[PDB]
Curated annotation (Swiss-Prot), chains A, B, C, D:
Primary gene name: uox
Family: Belongs to the uricase family.
Protein name per Swiss-Prot or TrEMBL: Uricase
Role noted for this protein: Catalyzes the oxidation of uric acid to 5-hydroxyisourate, which is further processed to form (S)-allantoin.
Self-association and partners: Homotetramer.
Entry keyword Oxidoreductase: yes
GO molecular function, one term: urate oxidase activity
The keyword Oxidoreductase is assigned to this record: yes
EC number annotated for this UniProt entry: 1.7.3.3
Length: 292, 292, 292, 292
């Protein structure tokens, strides 16, 4: 039997970094969960256990903290520095994947050095280097939203396994997971993150939803229309079901007030909204959620 | 050998409830995770499988939703109504434990019916009824806070196993878990919750910490001194370590800027702060964290 | 306003320890998650930030690993050594709480030094020292069991909020969480753990269940009747509902075959089975599930 | 600005299914977590809220349970039945992705209808249909393994950020996540699953590891050489670090006995092992870990 090494990558995952900026009395906090993985010629490491090409995962971790000493303006720019370092510093390293989760902190009553975690969303960044190409995908996850009315679902086809009732008034609730790919690295990454977040919240709240597919489409369209530097945005939105409870056996009516919030199962509506004519299949999406 | 049924309680746990208030166009959301457990004469249920006294856990669940239809001003008042219902409605039920987690929602851009989850803290309430006595413990959990300076740890004894270096400047980070026992049910539960939350944050931020014990003591003291309706407050604070990274092997210094945020192990500092002369060990605390 | 420090304890939680025994070619693995907390005179630590009495949590951790170097026959005996060390080594330490989770490993094809995790149960031990008294509570958690028939629930009272249908055939599924208190430290801890585990599984499987209360009672009774060294056993059993799916809308019957395994809500049935005349409320149970 | 709908899929995720086989005294349990997603012409659903093509996610769920009523020989054959149903039954549905997690149960003391969960591994299956082409990827996850010796790491390059010491004796521990793509569906999926699991464990245990890359390569080679029906296998192996504790400050040596099992960070070593001449990149892998 003939065996060959295919797609592979390796490194150090979930390096927890906190960078305190204390040049003045008003401190700043940058809180990251960083993953560094390299791609290139690692044939002999796999087939013979030859580690001559294996930049140690411990070394990748050390590089994260050493680079953090210098500071970094944004999460994306920190990842860009790491990826350029590894691809330019090792002849057999031809690319890789560097990703981070950014955790937000609010000041406690605007104190200089006292903070509380904002857990209501997590920011993400994924950078993939392939030779001279650098591709950045920023994102938001864990942002839970809900409309208590202004959502309908009707006109769907019915087969012998269809029992779902049509409705013109229902709760629509989801966890916004969204990732958007930049077509350039020359981006004001923090300002675009704040803008995209506001656009997604606005389009979710203000669209009269006939389907979560339609809501998601309007969210993506609002992003693409406002940001030339973004080629496409992907969203994965669970439909977190709120079932109207039958109170009639207890002698009561339920005028869209009392709901059971189910855990599982849940709708899972996923879509890509792209600028007309842009690249259909960027390679970064192949590993954006993981290798396997 | 002789065997006997000891302490027992039973019911339905984690009933997820959403109550929408839509009498006007400005909707309100109340989002709870409710547990109902009964105590009393359940001997024959255990020793013989005689279910004559076993009010069904399904029935307790149904009662949660049916009662929710009427509305409720606060989480505590809803639990009080449930506990009164079960203890007065069944002769063999002498008490129980009713608990809820309250999840907070903010409006999206002040919209009437569009909301986003505030995940940065979870409110709790536990009500225990014993005969004619009832006790309420309110609480907060999941609130993560951090001081980037203004924390010291020195003067600790040094035994054969002590290697930690004294310091006058370190990060102090914790997850605030706090539960306080009311001495009366005549409380503005929402206003006291908001007050206690603010007091805990303020005392954490403003105390120059020589020990996490001291910070916690000042937090509890601020609560007790401001709220006559509270007899005691228990806190459990992990010390979520942020280790100063050694960058000297790389030719760099680390002036309290670059930190490794460790997962485990962690310090766990726990204390009770009480009003002088108040009850020493109320029974409600014995099962506040669970039965076993 | 007069404030006083009440019950308090502090230490290092979740110290992950792996002890390899390699005196011979056949290696052994002991895999523990250890928590060490001290009790005594810590007044000045809380009220003034005086750390003269504060044995550092880092020191407690170091003590765990240093003691592990000597080896230990069982988890309980390792906790006993730690607790005796801290209570005898510091005049102001009068007691404390030491706990561990033991994770089980199986050999891979009976190899000397290659193992795979047995994740189907986690063993627990909690030791509390109070002056000269040493109290040990051993336990099992995470053991999920299911009977596909041989379970009934009928004869329960019906109020206006009761809609549950009686049944003579249903699935009974639970997560066994069980903790038993020894009345002596002179115990063959591994052999009793193996016995108790077998007794609980046997009583679950072989009891024709008219109620989860009855099943739980029989499980505890088998333990108490077999083990003179155990005074009492507490169980907390979720009723993990498997709902019989209604397939009649699709033209099909469902003869107890197709089920929906719900996440929440769930029954939560909790009880104590004790040897007649034994102590009613040992203080260790007050903190067995946590401080607050 | 012109906007276009790109890649999209939708359906019902995490349908928890338990199928009891009880036509005779010896009951069998099949315990699945099933996800169904459709692909095809859903343009008007997104751009206009026209649901004429939207087979309801509730309907996909109902189909899971109705089909389960007939029984199914393996998880893969159940997914194949679902995918064939949806792609043939709706003209505008051109394909999709159906996935399942299978949870294993063991008998309690060989009882006919009493079981306990085997939590030590989770089986997975993913089926993708595109037009007339289909592909099945089976897998295993959550299987934790450990070698206490027989692992080395040396010969790696040393840059300015490298501090790791070479070693010839260390612990190697990982969580086996492995997914293999079949080149035909005419197979005994249960027998191949058991075979692959055994081969992976054996190759992990018996390879003298000079690198986790090498161990992973040998595990994949062992699978490819014995299974002509498999074209390729992907693995993602964390290096779950067990650090040799420094006991020298305590006057003790540590001859590879006492280890600290760290949570994060960890090595993450990922590779594909393919049969020579087989398809280099199969589209099923682009979404195998999620959409985004």
């Amino acid at each position: 039997t003939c065996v060959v090494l295919g797609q592979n990558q390796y490194g150090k995952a979930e390096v927890r970094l906190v960078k305190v900026t204390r040049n003045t009395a008003r401190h700043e906090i940058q809180d990251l969960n960083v993953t560094s993985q390299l791609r290139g010629d690692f044939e002999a490491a796999h087939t013979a256990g030859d580690n001559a090409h294996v930049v140690a995962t411990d070394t990748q971790k050390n590089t994260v903290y050493a680079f953090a000493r210098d500071g970094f303006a944004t999460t994306e720019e920190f990842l860009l520095r790491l990826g350029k370092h590894f691809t330019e510093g090792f002849d057999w390293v031809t690319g890789g994947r560097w990703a981070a989760q950014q955790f937000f902190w609010d000041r406690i009553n605007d104190h200089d050095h006292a903070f509380s975690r904002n857990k209501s969303e997590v920011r993400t960044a994924v950078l993939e280097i392939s030779g001279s190409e650098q591709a950045i995908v920023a994102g938001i996850e864990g942002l839970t939203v809900l409309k208590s009315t202004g959502s309908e679902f009707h006109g769907f086809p019915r087969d012998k396994y269809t029992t779902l009732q049509e409705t013109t008034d229902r709760i629509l609730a989801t966890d916004v997971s969204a990732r958007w790919r930049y077509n350039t690295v020359e981006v004001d990454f923090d300002a675009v993150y704040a803008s995209v977040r506001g656009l997604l919240l606005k389009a979710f709240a203000e669209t009269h939803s006939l389907a979560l597919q339609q809501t998601m489409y309007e969210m993506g369209r609002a992003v693409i229309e406002t940001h030339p530097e973004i080629d496409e945005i992907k969203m994965s939105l669970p439909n977190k079901h709120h079932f109207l409870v039958d109170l009639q056996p207890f002698g009561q009516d339920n005028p869209n007030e009392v709901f059971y919030a189910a855990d599982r199962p849940y709708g899972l509506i996923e879509a890509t909204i792209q600028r007309c004519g842009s690249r259909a299949d960027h390679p970064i999406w192949s590993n954006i959620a993981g290798f396997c």
